Amino acid sequence: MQLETAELEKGLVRTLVDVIGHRLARDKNNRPNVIRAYPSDNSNDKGLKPDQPFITVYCQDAATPYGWVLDKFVEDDVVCYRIAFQIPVLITVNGKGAHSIMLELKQRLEMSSVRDLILEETGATVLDTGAIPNDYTYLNTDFENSAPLVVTLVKNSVLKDERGSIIERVIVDGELVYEEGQEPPEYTIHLDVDSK
Amino acid sequence: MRLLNRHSFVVKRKVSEDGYYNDDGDWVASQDIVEVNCKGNIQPYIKGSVKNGTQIALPEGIRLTDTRILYTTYKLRTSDDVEWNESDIVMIDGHEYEVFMTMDWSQQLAHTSHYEYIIIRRDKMNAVRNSR
């Protein structure tokens, strides 16, 4: 499995539709309003703001606090590497009662279930979950209630080194001497070992 | 006059001024809403950083903000905490426009006394009720 935030966001979006979809608004296709941040298509088209309440998913960054390389192994003749990653994600609810919805979303991510569905879709484990503020932003006319939350994930990624190769034959030479630097060696041992 | 009555629009005035705070602290708007027919003139408001039909790009999507200036002889009122009344609503293009500013030019001259208002398009949000 390779690590790609584009897939983690999609998996989280698909999971949230079932986990917390009953509290959200629904579009013309009856689907709950969960979307990825900064919507756009065809390199210039821009999405419209859905009907409230809705959810936004945005991946912040990715780091490797756990060393630099976790494993190096051979799976088939191609060499492989494994690396441990950490990915903080930001989920926000916009509308009225955003805090009341974020609280229930928090209380469900900690269940034994749900954490299995997340791993089934994204193949990642939930590591931490931060606090929830209760924000108000003026916009125009009326304030909008919002409630962000940060959910950190952990995943292992594997890549293939197509430039690598393996050793399958070894040739060894040796000598024996009574004294250091004895120019004609007392004995010479030549060895050759094949994998087969 | 003719130019002051070029446009016809609907105004929603909350005739009752009995809004109050519940025993739980929530706000309850005045109950009796009444529709009226009025005539005036509506033009775009060009001043400073004012935004007429301006598309706004946000991480959450796209918004649309608009604001206009209205000349009329009808006395519309904005929110007032001392008099304890709420503002009026003006229906333009099927959307709501809340009266935010007023300028009293009445009682100045015979044939040219009027009023000026700045009306801002109401933002989109979901509805909730607290009525006791």
Task: Give the tokens for residue B35.
Answer: 């529709």
- Burial pattern A129-145, b for ≥16 Cβ within 10 A else e, equals eeebeeeeeeebeeebb
Closest by CA position to A33, among listed A56, A6, A8, A11:
A56
Contact B77, B99 (CB under 8 A): yes
Q: How far is CA A165 from CA A56, A73, A76, A162, A171, in A?
A: 45, 12, 11, 8, 17
B62 touches chain A (CB under 8 A): yes
Q: Which of A47, A58, A96 comes nearest B61 by C-beta?
A: A47
Which of the 8 DSSP states describes residue A100? H
Closest by CA position to A126, among listed A117, A115, A141:
A115
Contact A55, A24 (CB under 8 A): yes
Give CA–CA dist A102/A145, Å, rounded.
Answer: 12
- CA A91 to chain CA centroid, Å, is 15
* B61 neighbourhood in chain A, CB within 8 Å: 35, 39, 46-50
Give CA–CA dist A109/A129, Å, rounded.
Answer: 9
Give CA–CA dist A148/A126, Å, rounded.
Answer: 17
Q: Do A46 and B57 touch (CB under 8 A)?
A: yes
- CA A12 to chain CA centroid, Å, is 11
Contact A158, A132 (CB under 8 A): no
Give CA–CA dist A7/A34, Å, rounded.
Answer: 15
Cβ neighbour number for residue A98 with a 10 Å cutoff: 23
Measured in angstroms, the CA of A147 and the nearest CA of chain B are apart by 13
Chain breaks in chain B (C to N over 2.5 A) after: none
A94 touches chain B (CB under 8 A): yes
Rounded (10°) angle between helices A98-109 and A5-19: 100
Measured in angstroms, the CA of A51 and the nearest CA of chain B are apart by 7
Give CA–CA dist A8/B69, Å, rounded.
Answer: 48
Give CA–CA dist A125/A75, Å, rounded.
Answer: 24
Which of the 8 DSSP states describes residue B3? G
Q: Which of B126, B129, B130 has the most A C-beta neighbours within 10 Å, making it the best mutation to test the interface with A?
A: B126
Task: Give the tokens for residue A53.
Answer: 């309440």
* A100 neighbourhood in chain B, CB within 8 Å: none
Looking up tokens 């130019």 gives: B3
Closest by CA position to B105, among listed B129, B69, B79:
B69
Task: Give the tokens for residue B32.
Answer: 């009796």
A185 touches chain B (CB under 8 A): no
Nearest-Cα residue of chain B relative to residue A34: B60
Which of the 8 DSSP states describes residue A152? E
- Cβ neighbourhood burial of A69 (10 Å; 0-12, 13-18, 19+): exposed
Length of chain A: 196
Looking up tokens 């210039």 gives: A44
∠ at Cα B131 (B126, B132), nearest 5°?
155
Contact A162, A78 (CB under 8 A): yes
Closest by CA position to B129, among listed B34, B28, B5, B57:
B28
Task: Give the tokens for residue A174.
Answer: 């040796």
Q: Is the dihedral of CA B30, B35, B38, B41 positive or negative?
A: positive
Length of chain B: 132
Name the amino acid, one letter, at B5: N
Indicate the SS3 state at residue A83. Answer: strand
Give CA–CA dist B131/B27, Å, rounded.
Answer: 8
- Model resolution, angstroms: 3.1
Beta bridge partners of B95: B92
Q: Do A49 and B122 touch (CB under 8 A)?
A: no
Measured in degrees and rounded to the nearest 5, phi and psi for residue A109 equal -65, -15
Q: Chains A and B: how many Cβ contacts under 8 Å?
A: 52
Task: Give the tokens for residue B97.
Answer: 């426009």
Give CA–CA dist A92/A160, Å, rounded.
Answer: 36
Indicate the SS3 state at residue A23. Answer: helix
* B60 neighbourhood in chain A, CB within 8 Å: 37, 49, 56, 94
Q: How far is CA B21 from CA B13, B26, B29, B86, in A?
A: 20, 6, 9, 14
Give CA–CA dist A98/A148, Å, rounded.
Answer: 9
Closest by CA position to A27, among listed A54, A9, A45, A47:
A54
Measured in angstroms, the CA of A108 and the nearest CA of chain B are apart by 24
Looking up tokens 């979307």 gives: A35
B126 touches chain A (CB under 8 A): yes
